[PDB]
Amino acid sequence: TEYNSEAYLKKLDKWWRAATYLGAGMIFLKENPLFSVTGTPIKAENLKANPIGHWGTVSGQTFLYAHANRLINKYDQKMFYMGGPGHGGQAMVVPSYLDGSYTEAYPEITQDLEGMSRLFKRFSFPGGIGSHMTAQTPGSLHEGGELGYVLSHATGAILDQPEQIAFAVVGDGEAETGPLMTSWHSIKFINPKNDGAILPILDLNGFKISNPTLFARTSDVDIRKFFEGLGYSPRYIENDDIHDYMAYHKLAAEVFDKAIEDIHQIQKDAREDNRYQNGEIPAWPIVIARLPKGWGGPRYNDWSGPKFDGKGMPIEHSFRAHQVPLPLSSKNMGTLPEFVKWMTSYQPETLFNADGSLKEELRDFAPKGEMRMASNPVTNGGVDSSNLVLPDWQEFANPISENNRGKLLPDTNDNMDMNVLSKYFAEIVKLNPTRFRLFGPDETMSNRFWEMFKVTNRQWMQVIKNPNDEFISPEGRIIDSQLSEHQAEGWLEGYTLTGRTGAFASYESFLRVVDSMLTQHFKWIRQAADQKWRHDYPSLNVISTSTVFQQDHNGYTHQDPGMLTHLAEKKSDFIRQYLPADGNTLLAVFDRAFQDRSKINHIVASKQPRQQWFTKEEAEKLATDGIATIDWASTAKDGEAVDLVFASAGAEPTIETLAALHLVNEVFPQAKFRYVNVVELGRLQKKKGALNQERELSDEEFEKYFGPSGTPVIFGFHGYEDLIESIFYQRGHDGLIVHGYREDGDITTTYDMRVYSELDRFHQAIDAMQVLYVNRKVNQGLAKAFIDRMKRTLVKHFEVTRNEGVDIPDFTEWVWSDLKK
Amino acid sequence: YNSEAYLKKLDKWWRAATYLGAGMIFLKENPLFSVTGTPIKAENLKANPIGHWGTVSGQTFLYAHANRLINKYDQKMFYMGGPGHGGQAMVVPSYLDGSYTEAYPEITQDLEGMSRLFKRFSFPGGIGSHMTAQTPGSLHEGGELGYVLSHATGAILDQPEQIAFAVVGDGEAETGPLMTSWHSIKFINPKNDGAILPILDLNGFKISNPTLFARTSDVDIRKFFEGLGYSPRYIENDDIHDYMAYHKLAAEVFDKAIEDIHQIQKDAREDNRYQNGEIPAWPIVIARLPKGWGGPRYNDWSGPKFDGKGMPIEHSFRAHQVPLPLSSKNMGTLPEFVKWMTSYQPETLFNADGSLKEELRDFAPKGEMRMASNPVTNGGVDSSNLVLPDWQEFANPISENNRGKLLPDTNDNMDMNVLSKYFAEIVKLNPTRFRLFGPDETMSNRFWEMFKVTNRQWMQVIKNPNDEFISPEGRIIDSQLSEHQAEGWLEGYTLTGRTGAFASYESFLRVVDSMLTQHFKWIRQAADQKWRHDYPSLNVISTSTVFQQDHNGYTHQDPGMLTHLAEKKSDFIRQYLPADGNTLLAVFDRAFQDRSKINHIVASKQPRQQWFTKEEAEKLATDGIATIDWASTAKDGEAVDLVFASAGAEPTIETLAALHLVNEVFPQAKFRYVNVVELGRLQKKKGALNQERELSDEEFEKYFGPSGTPVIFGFHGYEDLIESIFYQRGHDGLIVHGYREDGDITTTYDMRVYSELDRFHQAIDAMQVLYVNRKVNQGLAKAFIDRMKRTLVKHFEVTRNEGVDIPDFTEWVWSDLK
């Protein structure tokens, strides 16, 4: 009863207004924050010249934040705040400022007049703090700039964290996005026996930037139908008199009380009785809060513009409240009277002392210590942020040696790199039963994670109908049963930022559905690295498999390897892209990836049976150094001059480049060349701008592999050719002869997909012989006879593939053999 | 059309189409083996069967019932397959009604043409597995799932007589884009637009999983769709093999759906209903058609057993792709294939010569009523470009006196607002064939003039004055916060013959990176089909660019779209970076006249200096590049000490100011300035379909001089794109200045210093290269460089102390060179 009395709710109301007062003031003022309490009227010099920030969403989110604090203290609940409308950065900064966590992160921002003035001036100021809930914000793991991912992130955050609740505010405009709409299905994968809970609040403030919202103009009856159809239990916070603030507080206290209690009851039944393990979906609460936009701020634009019913255009309860609600500035003080009236309406003299500190009677409202949402270790790298316990990856390595390199192992499944990787992943689940997860979009089986299903199932909460279904269970370390890349990526990001490690595998082309989500995750960890008070994070591991050259049953629309270019443009110090050519290298790169911190790890991996090349010693070197000269594939020994260099990155390119130099060496053993296998592609760059040099090769190391400028380089690449061309310009190295994907392909045979882009051995061999002849390193008779033979083979390729639907033995039957000399 | 006799005719037609769709997975010859009395041998079978089976029979069921509707109601309609991986479900229906032969005369409706089609399916040099542009009647390949309803909506916008028969996969229904595309009916006005007839193909499974909606109860499914404003009707049965029961029930449901759609359209067009906030109760059909319907039931030949039977194929995910291991190298399961294929009773469906039985030939529509012949599906009923006004009528009066200066009216210095004058007039000249799309950003992006001629289309209740510029009828669609919707609508609007534009914040346009990929692949593949008509171009605008974020920060900074689209076949991509308003006007005059392109325009919305006359603007938009004499001390193809070049508004401003600083102290330096608008012309990529607009080596040297000529290049996007271009051209000496992934909430000109794009860093590089090239003396260079450094020293101090920029930036105006 003590957390439900009107005396207590009036204290909450004051704390609420205290937070909203500061959030509003820092939009316009850079000093003199308590002008009406300290008896110092506003002067032009106190005002910002170009006020920046958002107002509309703020007061509604601080209302919800205040009520979240009440729940924490009343129920002793571990909880954290996630702001869907992240553009209202004040809704997280000042609540942290009021409970002392902000000062703990920023000692100079003290809880007095000096520190308050310092905070006002830093807000949305050059070199200060942003307007959004960036990593500068204590308690944030979600910036909310690019809208739509707050619920998928919240789900990943509460997976395997049974004691945590995610207090997730969803903007009603945000609710119109694709990712947000489908993220409501997340409760079909949350098992209350082992996982925490998300408490979603739909912030139905009625408007977005310039429009009303589709859900706000949906009736409460239809809103109920929508959420009940998805398995939720909707409860409503609304009132006919929007300024009877105490009426909202009483109702919010009732609704939120039953929301937590129903969540706890759901968790009790699942953990003590074993409920919800038979296909029953818990009736998870969802709170629909109709809190008018710009709540408690300017009501009408009376100072300019047209009139309606003797008043200016409405600001409160309209889109016009979204950003800066007044034209006030140091250059335009016309609306200063309106600002003073607005700011004093909060009664700041009842909220703050003259010395800037919060009134004594309000200091016990917020939680203390780690119970504060801004201090919850979930929001600062996770309660436990340690890396995985890894087994020795060599226990799952292929037995490659000098005598079977470049050949197919007897068990076809061992020639499938993804399947070999699943062996390693399967053991990791055994060693990390609660802190490792695999995510996919209905592709884990198609991507050949076959060993994973020997140790776990896909987590699936709805009814199960074996044998029509397979490898699904209410408890599972894999989450794969929703067809949405946004979901898989959002879950992984939330899981990763909260201290755990996982992997998200997808068809290569369709991982680009999530191009912008990866951008945002890079942005976050890059900014988080600049915060000395923040712990680092585990790395985000995304796998591009079923790649351009391995989409047999799916044609041209499943071919886009451009993710390599997209991520190569970010700061390299936070990006690690790996193109292992075989299973042993793939195992070795993930041993490294799983130990790296605050990275995005992008691995391009093969799933179809392919020749295996490198010993587990060679694989270790390739994964550690990321690049290497392969002596058994080279005719030029250490420190020798070369006529050209062969290099490749990727499984298919490596097979074809190795085959090309073999074909050349068969007729011309005198040609001197090195073969260089490229795994860590970022090592080759030399970009302008800082935070790109951590792994870039020195000029000496680069020349050791590719020789001096002018050295021809036959470079087989998995992705688009522009990325390699930019690299060799950055390195000032003329002579690159790139062979990558050229946006050509369709339904065809395995090796014709390589001929489509002229990546194949025969087109590469021609270019190699042509440059040798052009450089007068070989006589014309031999050059012409060889090139004619390569051309004859390609003619046969086109006849057999179009007439028979199979590849020629020149491709299919080839195995590696020692070079001549 | 409801008699048992007619429905048995429909059932035979259905089994005939499904028989061929299944057979072409495995056979390349002898397609009617049981009718011609020629049992299957290994040489008749494909070596590596390719394709999908699970989804087809359900889609051919729906296609057949769609044909019934067309004939019964005389309805103009077209098919859209969400699960596009079952391409035969659109190929074979087209083959049976003659439209396929009209497109491919060699694929005749006889035994020979039938064998030819079997061999072409999913074969090297044949046709694909999906509903590609090779498929007559398709405007939606369905490879990347999730956009069938957004495309369907755009297709029926401004086409009141058309119905989009759009089938939604139940796995596809789990994606973000589809889930939110259900909101489209909040923007369809039955008074002026067509109708979508969506069918949720609840076959129960996707690749390897059951589906979330299939395991949702019919009661909850009803709650879901009624909450979204639809009227759900169900097709299901307890006995999944009582095919005539499904036919009867499907006929009732589909009849009632068409009639309810027509009643909605009549009430809207005759009585004026649904103009006051009432959303029509649009029908949505929930069809529980088992996956692998009518095919193999259990994997009796291998694998584990359950209840004395093999693992289920029908009514399971195992039917998704190739349901048998049969092949020319593995004939073990030929009996299962023969039993499966003969179960359709092909002897009752096809004649021995391969032709379709006579009693079945009258089932499908004829002529343009066939969904495969509907002009909607081949470039649109009307595919003409917009009628355009002379863009010069909205140009700024730029001349030698006011170049490089702010016009007195601040709104004329904002290119997007100037563009909105042009778009507003286009609305008046094309009231039913031009539309503007945005994701709650049209006003934010400063299309202010558009709102004086039209409103946003919005079907729910309106509450003025709290609302603004929304109406049940409007040429703008902007009131849904979803890039997937805006892009999907535009794509459907475009492929069906109309033209529009989609404007978005630059960094958030990348939400639909993959959608633009799919549209490019489509128009490129459509170009390879000689029977296919052209398309209008897809116009997308990237605004609020990286160097124009005031109220937003680092998360709104990503100009990587330029690189993404530059990697596709450049013959279908046009990227323009106009530096001022007059160029932007001229670019869209050209963009709106191009065919089968993606036009990506990077444009400024904040007030900036204006540079080019309407004569220069025309030349920049036509040639895409030009040497600017008044910013040059040397001519084209003439010797120079270095070259200045830029692409974009902010980069052009700083590069122009940089060369001005050099010439100000050292007018002896000989250089030309080159403004770059059509960036793709500078490329020289390997691979075909990239050469149409590429500069010749002679043209490239005319602008940038020979290899070794230093080139100070200011660029809007990431630097690697320029570096790749100059490697393709073998041109040593590039000194690129682009976005370098550095930025934050800061001042206008500091966003440029963050990446060292500013004039002062550019001037330093320019003087440094002259010194290394021994065309200047050390004393002059260091005094200049030290001065440049000193100016940068102050820049860092003022902005961090006051929150405003220094007069060295804000007060600079263009003046004549020496």
Ligand SMILES: Cc1ncc(C[n+]2csc(CCOP(=O)(O)OP(=O)(O)O)c2C)c(N)n1
């Ligand atoms: C995917 C995406 N597109 C566009 C934007 C630009 N944007 C920022 S805020 C906003 C309006 C958000 O409305 P709402 O979610 O209702 O927040 P609130 O009403 O609390 O301000 C938009 C469209 C964005 N953030 N994300």
Ligand SMILES: Cc1ncc(C[n+]2csc(CCOP(=O)(O)OP(=O)(O)O)c2C)c(N)n1
């Ligand atoms: C965005 C996206 N992610 C993944 C895929 C890969 N994929 C192809 S088919 C398929 C299953 C689709 O199932 P459903 O929608 O139920 O169609 P059905 O075959 O059952 O008719 C998937 C996941 C895809 N095409 N698009």
Ligand SMILES: [Mg+2]
């Ligand atoms: Mg809102």
Ligand SMILES: [Mg+2]
């Ligand atoms: Mg399905």
